[PDB]
Design a binder for this molecule. Structure first.
Ligand code: CL
Length: 229
């Protein structure tokens, strides 16, 4: 049993996230549900106190193996199992700060555990990330291409909505590296439509978020694959 056969739904998730932003150290944990392909939720919470940054910005740090792929595009993230992969992200909040994250994953008993680190340095202390002035981030299309002999790269531009209805941009890039000692067949260049929605639990006492991601792959631009050898 490998690849897509390891992702029979429903499944669950856990996260352990150790973070630091502008020298403010924090920890997040969470548990989540993946009812079906491409729809995955996570109820996270700060275990150190209040989260010292926007929950909207931390949303993408908070599981691409749960994205929904058609049969005719390789689901690289699922095909990495068994063995797993690492994810390394850079998120540049333009004019604000840059953060990085590193993710390791393990699958056991239908549950993917993410162990993530986040490091953010140089953020504007009056910016929207630190002041928690974002309402949501808009849905976007993430470009996925082969990268190196055995990886893939994900890129996106994110529009972050401030309370005043205006936008701030983030630029996001990730590299995905199989860690399983084996070559995983790269997909053709394609895109992932991603929507992140956040709400609060009616009763939880912690600083927390209840987040849902919808992530659906498609060959949006058939010609794109020719450009990536
Ligand atoms: Cl927030």
């Amino acid at each position: 049993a490998s690849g897509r056969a390891l992702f029979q739904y429903p499944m669950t998730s856990k996260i352990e996230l150790n973070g630091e932003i502008n020298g403010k150290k924090f920890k997040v944990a969470g548990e989540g549900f993946t009812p079906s392909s491409g729809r995955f939720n996570m109820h996270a919470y700060c275990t150190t106190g209040d989260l010292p940054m926007s929950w909207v910005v931390i949303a993408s740090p908070l599981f691409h193996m749960f994205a929904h792929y058609p049969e005719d595009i390789t689901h690289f993230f699922q095909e990495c199992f068994p063995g797993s992969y690492t994810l390394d992200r850079t998120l540049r909040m333009e004019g604000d700060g840059t953060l990085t994250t590193h993710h390791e994953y393990s699958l056991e008993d239908g549950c993917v555990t993410s162990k993530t680190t986040l490091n953010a340095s140089g953020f504007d202390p009056k910016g929207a990330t630190m002041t928690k002035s974002f309402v949501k981030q808009l849905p976007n299309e993430v470009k996925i291409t082969p990268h190196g002999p055995n990886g893939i790269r994900l890129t996106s531009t994110v529009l972050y909505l401030k309370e005043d209805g205006t936008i701030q941009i983030g630029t996001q890039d990730c590299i995905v590296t199989p860690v399983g000692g084996r070559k995983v067949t790269q997909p053709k260049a394609h895109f992932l439509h991603t929507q992140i929605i956040q709400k609060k639990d009616p009763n939880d006492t912690r600083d927390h978020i209840v987040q849902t991601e919808l992530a659906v792959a498609g060959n949006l631009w058939h010609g794109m694959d020719e450009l990536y050898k």
